[model samples]
Target: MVSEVRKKKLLHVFTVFFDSDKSGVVEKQDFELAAQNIAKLRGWAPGSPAYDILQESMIAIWLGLQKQADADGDGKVTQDEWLALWDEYAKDPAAAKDWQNLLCKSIFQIQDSSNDGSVDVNEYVTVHESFGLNKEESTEAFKKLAKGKDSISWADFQELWKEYFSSDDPDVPGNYIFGRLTC
Candidate 1:
């Protein structure tokens, strides 16, 4: 049985992904149109660079889910396994922070791949590659990050950082040092 809150959050994740323009809300039409566009964008034929990335990304998603599959001590995960895992994290601030910190550290390593102070196109692609995108898809994604023919500026990086890390919602759980983690 899924909690209504978790169901709502999952729906919100879908909405956020579908809202291409990122206007902070997803209208009905936005969801429908985004479904279509996402299909087309990912439907590249074989041998194409985009196709390679799409295929690889599929694998990466699976791997990422597996990494989060710790509900049962056995290591394998089914849908119930994943749902339970997320529920556990969602129910505890300390657990949630542990998960978030893992994500943050992984992404930070990608952004700082070169270890030369800041992220450049190569470093960004290296991060994308971790997501299982091929060079072509990685390149295309990085191009979008570069902001339409201009170089990647500090402002652009800031926006990306906020998009990835900033959460102003007061409802988001945070780590607390009380006797034990609780809601």
Candidate 2:
């Protein structure tokens, strides 16, 4: 199951996507709009090479959130609904791992700009910064992710994501993937 610290970090990431209206709740439309912006940013147009990957990732995130967070069938996600979903999954270790794997794969695909099945330091830093990490944090994260290599291979990325999502060790390099963790 997701540890309380990790759950809090994940919730912060979710808020980064959902709290567009500054109302502290996530509406369905907000999720859609964020997807559109992501598509645009990634140049995932009709004929773009990244189109399919972007589409799949967008659908996964949107549908996953809607399915899990749309309590009361109102087609929107209130803070309570969102928290409830996390709470339910926090009790199941397997479910938490599944959630992390799904999210990490989607994000990794988008960051692989060269489509070479890997992310270079530049690309890693860029994506992290785009997700609200400052330059210093992104740089540090890139160092951790690169691990003295020029780039992070698909397998390496997956390992890092898994460790970051599961480990509570403050000094772990994976913990630097999203910048320095508070815990």
Candidate 3:
């Protein structure tokens, strides 16, 4: 099971992605808006491979969250439903793992700009910068994560996500995934 701290971090990320209106609730279209915004930020042209990958990934994530968090068949996720879903995830390791896996997969797909199976340091830094991380910090974090390697494979990316969101250790590479967490 995910620890309470980890669950809180996950919730923050979820809200950031799915609460486009900042109304403290998640709706289906929020996912699409987020995808569109990111695509625009990255200057991904329409019909490009990267653009298509992001669109597909965000929709998949939205559908999964809807299925899990939209209790009462309301077609949207209220705060109560989100809390319930988080509580359920906290108690179920398998469910949490599945969610994390999906998150990592989507992130990797989005950041791997060349449509290659891995993310090089430049791509990694660009993603962190888009998330508001300063260039120096992003470069340092990429260096730490890469550890002299030219790129990070999907397996390594998954491990980075786990460490970043789930671990409390201050020095882990994952902690820098979002350019450092306040907690």
RMSD of 2: 3.4
Q: List the pairs of residues colliding in candidate 1.
A: none
- Per-residue lDDT of model 3, residues 9-33, tens digit only: 6665655546765667788788777
Worst 10 residues of 2 by lDDT: 28-37
lDDT per residue as tens, model 1, 1-183:
445544544333323332334544333344334333433543535656654444344334334545666345453444456456656655564655554554444434334523454556665554334323465655665665665543444445545543333333323321100001112
Better of 1 and 3 by lDDT: 3
Each model's TM-score, in the order given? 0.38, 0.74, 0.76
Local distance difference test, candidate 2: 0.67
Please name the candidate that would achieve the greatest lDDT relative to the true structure.
Answer: 3
Residue pairs in steric clash, candidate 2?
1-93
Q: CA shift at 179, candidate 3, in angstroms?
A: 2.8
How many clashing pairs per prediction, in order?
0, 1, 1
Q: Model 3, which residues run further than 4 Å from truth?
A: 1-4, 47-50, 78-80, 131-135, 168-171
Residue ranges of candidate 2 with Cα displaced over 4 Å:
1-4, 17-23, 28-56, 97-99, 180-183
* Model 1 local distance difference test score: 0.43
